[PDB]
Design a protein around this nucleic acid. Structure first.
Lengths: 206, 262, 143
RNA sequence: GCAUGUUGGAACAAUGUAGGUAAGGGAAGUCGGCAAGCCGGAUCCGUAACUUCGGGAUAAGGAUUGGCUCUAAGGGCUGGCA
RNA sequence: UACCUGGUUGAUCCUGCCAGUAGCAUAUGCUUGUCUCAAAGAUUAAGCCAUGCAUGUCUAAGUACGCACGGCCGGUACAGUGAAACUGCGAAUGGCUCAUUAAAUCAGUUAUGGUUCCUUUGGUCGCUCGACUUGGAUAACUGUGGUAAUUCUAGAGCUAAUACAUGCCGACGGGCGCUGACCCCCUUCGCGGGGGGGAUGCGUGCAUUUAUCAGUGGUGACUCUAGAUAACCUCGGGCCGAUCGCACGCCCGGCGGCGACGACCCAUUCGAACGUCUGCCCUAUCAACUUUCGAUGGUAGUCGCCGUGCCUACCAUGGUGACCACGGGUGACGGGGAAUCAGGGUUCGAUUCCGGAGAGGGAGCCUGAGAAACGGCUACCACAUCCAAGGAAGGCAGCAGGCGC
RNA sequence: AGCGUAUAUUAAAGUUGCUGCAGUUAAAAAGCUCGUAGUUGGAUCUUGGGAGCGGCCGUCCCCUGCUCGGCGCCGGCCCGAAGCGUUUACUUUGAAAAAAUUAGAGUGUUCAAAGCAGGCCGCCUGGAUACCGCAGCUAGGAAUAAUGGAAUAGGACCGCGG
């Protein structure tokens, strides 16, 4: 196949690097993983040194860190948005490191509405019809209501994130390599990074 | 190479083993253990060549099955066990405890010690590794994992441990003017105090070790092993005492001993 | 006036999106008795191939040379000059071995013909294994 | 603009005139590859002998030739900028 | 040993070479009384091989109803030897030779802070808050057979594991933080404000990742380790002893020492790989060369156990060399060394002592920690073997020895 | 119990010449000058003084500083330790430089090629050195060849003020 070597090409001056030996087993290069989105299926590959490598094939979930409160949850991946260098990976939904994905807003919405006890998302016109969190919001004690108010005061979020929680599709990046370790970990884009990627999205669209 | 070595050549050997060329072609390969390859000396060679008890290799195998030789707090019956710097080889039947100390030349010196002296030995630590919950683990010169140490035990400070329990008794702090056995390179087996410390960033620091006979020599930081606090050794010393006298004086003392003997 | 590439360029240590209401610059020392210039602290440049504000280890051999080319970006080409004594004919011969050295963008006002200190590091590219430590000016040229 | 150019209908002999198709070999027939037949355009790589250095040269030679649906690059007007 | 003679002319001095002269390591020829040692398919033929061989191992401490044998008092299977096996390790070293091979290998020198690592040693083997031991396939054996024929084979009767999977008694009764009903205390007429005890539920050990805050020990140097918070624990799945053996004892059913093996994680030994400075044979009837099927750099991915256009999209048009880059040849593996030899120099080195290469020429591949292994696997070409003409198989530049030279 | 001969090669050579070649008449100055790389290059920057022991002559000590502390002593002096005080080549020293090999301490294999042995009526030793040019590092001095200061003055220093 193909391997990692320096002797196959020419020198810096221009000479020809002629070899002095045949093949080696450690000189070996495997093809890419090229994972997709779908049902859970991960292959394993035994590598040099008695170690294992988890190659992902299809994965529809992911763990993404929200950097302000530093708390991550398992979050469903629904769509691939944009890649920087290769624009063909925007069309062909192939996940590698440093790609933008749409993720669901419901686990972080449930965490916010359970801990902070404040309405997250909730476009004006549709009230809470099952009435599950409305009991947890009200019916509190007088001495703990001050602690709830102090937690309520330090809970300001920006409008650029508020619109994304309104639509229910957050943006996220890829930090861990899915081919090397197996886990597709990442983080949520915030602030100037989110403005930069949304400016690239707007420049691609119109 | 496709794999490790199984055999060992007699020519590929250091100078201090004193292995001659005529007797053998294939050298006894030492097994893997705490000490290095060239630093140690095998037990079968130490039995048949240096002390000269047995002659053939099968006799050492017949001896070691009856479990006579005890190595530094353990009855070890391995003929190719690496026995290196500051090891105590105890024999219960003959009652001759030996201590491995370098001579004033590059060779070792056979020295018999009391059982009270064989109860302890001197060792050196290398580093302090941080555990999974902030637990300091000592790294000795031949990998003795002992955790929860004393905070005064630094890198250059040496400790005095016990064989059967593996616990410290005393410690020699790395200070100026302490006796140091320089073990490495050309200046091998030297006794002298530290009269000057010179620092060097990047590389290791050079130390001007001075013997109290009008002799001084500079040696890098790797060949440092202090034994006592200034002028107080807690070990017994063999003949030679680390003088580093000249070859003309050695020839004169040899001629004087020859004229005294006859 | 940064990030002309397609991807987002940043330092992996700093964090700029915490709960607030100028970003502080992150740097580390190189050691071996050296200091840092004021422009490296005051600037806002980012480069991962930097000993101070980056991730590379300077160790091994420390050599010197002279700068002769500044055509390629983010790197310079140096040229060593030394002699050697031949035991057969008791005269000297000429030797030179040129090499490419990565150039940190903090060194702004650098001209050709100045003495440069190179330091061995990990191979970042095919024929570059050295970084720039300090640049000293030649004779004169106060302007 | 025209109603097949001094005529219409019928069957489909041989031999004529003009065309093509032809298993296999491929100028071995004949003064005579005569006639007849093959190659064919565009893009890309690439090119000898001799030379009045201009020609050779398209030398000799090779690979590609659809449908459907996308991505990237190159401009005017107004008030570093939209 | 820092050293000489003769020869051009009718005759004499210079230059010029020739004739010898003294060695080393190969063959040939004469002769070869003894003894200590003692080289010998390197030169052309890395071309092919008739013949025999070069890789096996049990202790009471893995599995033994082979009577193949054995103690008899057999009955609680079990004294022991024990063919043939399963299971675990090595088989990845050694030897041969210089074709290929001239910044390549190789010699002082060093760094992996940019990574792995069999075995041994030292730890680790009641940290988790949850069956007086559960399940079925099979090797060895017997028996029906085919095949010119292979160290080529199946259906049946069977049976075991330190082989394959699922998962318990105890430690274990209580702590750590998130959630918090509700009560109670101090001041105020009371709400408001402050401060302790606390019903119920959740997770709560190491291995792995993501990301924030803070900063015990050490380094010339941290984005090294560690502290806190929040989740991950991939079914192609990290650990959390459903193991074997010799003599043995004290208290109402329970209790305990001396062994072998394995395992989450770390140090160490043995190494391999990756590096940087310096050194090399000739030739200018070789002066320009290298490239968009990367030549010289960057951003972001892929890959590798790590650091690299190694491979990918887009930008810049660079880089080396007259101190000989590049190409061609070498009757060229490299170094330590050997010979003649004054001092200086010349030639050879394939060889034991060190490092790399490969098993007719290539191509690709499994297994295991370590192999592109070679007396490992498969395909093409050449050489080339048996045959019921249906088909099968091999690669001595190993030991002795042969063919051609 | 050793030689003649043949094939590769060394000294003889100052008949290849750094030690150590010639160029009128033997082969060897381009017909001739200019000319870029390369070689090499005028002079020139601290010139002896103080103390001791002998017979002006040989030896011996002196002619860059300030943060932390110990031979200490009475706000001060001495010295102990880190830091830094243009840069080379050469020279002095140290670190480091597998064995065998070359010279060889010891050395009755009866001598030698050897070898690292062995000898005293229970014991004692030796089993080293020279060699390892160049490459990298550490410690002295500044003769030799380069090397920089301030003259469109943004030259030092000492007291400053915002």
């Amino acid at each position: 196949g193909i391997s990692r070597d320096n002797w196959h090409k020419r020198r810096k001056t221009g000479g020809k690097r002629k070899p002095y030996h045949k093949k080696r087993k450690y000189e070996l290069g495997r093809p890419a993983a090229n994972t997709k989105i779908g049902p859970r299926r991960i292959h394993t590959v035994r590598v040099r040194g008695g170690n294992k490598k988890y190659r992902a094939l299809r994965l529809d979930v992911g763990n993404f860190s929200w950097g302000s409160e530093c708390c991550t949850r398992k979050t469903r991946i629904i769509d691939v948005v944009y890649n920087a260098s290769n624009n063909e990976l925007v069309r062909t939904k192939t996940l590698v490191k440093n790609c933008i994905v749409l993720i669901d807003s419901t686990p972080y919405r449930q965490w916010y509405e359970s801990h902070y006890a404040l309405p997250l998302g909730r476009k004006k016109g549709a009230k809470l019809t099952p009435e599950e969190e409305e009991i947890l919001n009200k019916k509190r004690s007088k001495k703990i209501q001050k602690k709830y108010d102090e937690r309520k005061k330090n809970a300001k979020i920006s409008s650029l994130l508020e619109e994304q929680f309104q639509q229910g599709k957050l943006l996220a990046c890829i930090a861990s390599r899915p081919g090397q370790c197996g886990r597709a970990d990442g983080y949520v884009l915030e602030g100037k990074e989110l403005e930069f990627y949304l400016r690239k999205i707007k420049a691609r669209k119109g | 190479a496709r794999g490790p070595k199984k055999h060992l050549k007699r020519v590929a050997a250091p100078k201090h083993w004193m292995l001659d060329k005529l007797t053998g072609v294939f050298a006894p390969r030492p097994s893997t253990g705490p000490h290095k390859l060239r630093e140690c000396l095998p037990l079968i060679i130490f039995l048949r060549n240096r002390l000269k008890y047995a002659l053939t290799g099968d006799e050492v195998k017949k001896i070691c099955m009856q479990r006579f030789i005890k190595i530094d707090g353990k009855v070890r019956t391995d003929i190719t066990y690496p026995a290196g710097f500051m090891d105590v080889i105890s024999i219960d039947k003959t009652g001759e405890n030996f201590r491995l100390i370098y001579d004033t030349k590059g060779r070792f010196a056979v020295h018999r010690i009391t059982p009270e002296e064989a109860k302890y030995k001197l060792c050196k630590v290398r580093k302090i590794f941080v555990g999974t919950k902030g637990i300091p683990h000592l790294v000795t010169h031949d990998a003795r994992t002992i955790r929860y140490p004393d905070p005064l035990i630094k890198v250059n400070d040496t400790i005095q441990i016990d064989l059967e329990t593996g616990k410290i008794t005393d410690f020699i702090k790395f200070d100026t003017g302490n006796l140091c056995m320089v073990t490495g390179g050309a200046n091998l087996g030297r006794i002298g105090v530290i009269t000057n410390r010179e620092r060097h960033p990047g590389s290791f620091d050079v130390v001007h070790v001075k013997d109290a006979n009008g002799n001084s020599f500079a040696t890098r930081l790797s060949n440092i092993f202090v034994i006592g606090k200034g002028n107080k050794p807690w070990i017994s010393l063999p003949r030679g005492k680390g003088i580093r006298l000249t070859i003309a004086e050695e020839r004169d003392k040899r001629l004087a001993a020859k004229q005294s003997s006859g | 006036d940064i990030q002309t590439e397609r991807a987002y360029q940043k330092q992996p240590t700093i964090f700029q999106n915490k709960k607030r209401v100028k970003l502080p610059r992150y740097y580390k020392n190189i050691g071996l008795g050296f200091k840092t210039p004021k422009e490296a602290i005051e600037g806002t440049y980012i480069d991962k191939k930097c000993p101070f504000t980056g991730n590379v280890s300077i160790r091994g051999r420390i050599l010197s040379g002279v700068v002769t080319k500044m055509k390629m970006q983010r790197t310079i080409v140096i040229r060593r000059d030394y002699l050697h004594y031949i035991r057969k004919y008791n005269r000297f011969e000429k030797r030179h071995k040129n090499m490419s050295v990565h150039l940190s963008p903090c060194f702004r006002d650098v001209q050709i013909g100045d003495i440069v200190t190179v330091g061995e590091c990990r191979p970042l590219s095919k024929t570059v294994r050295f970084n720039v430590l300090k640049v000293t000016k030649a004779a004169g040229t106060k302007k």
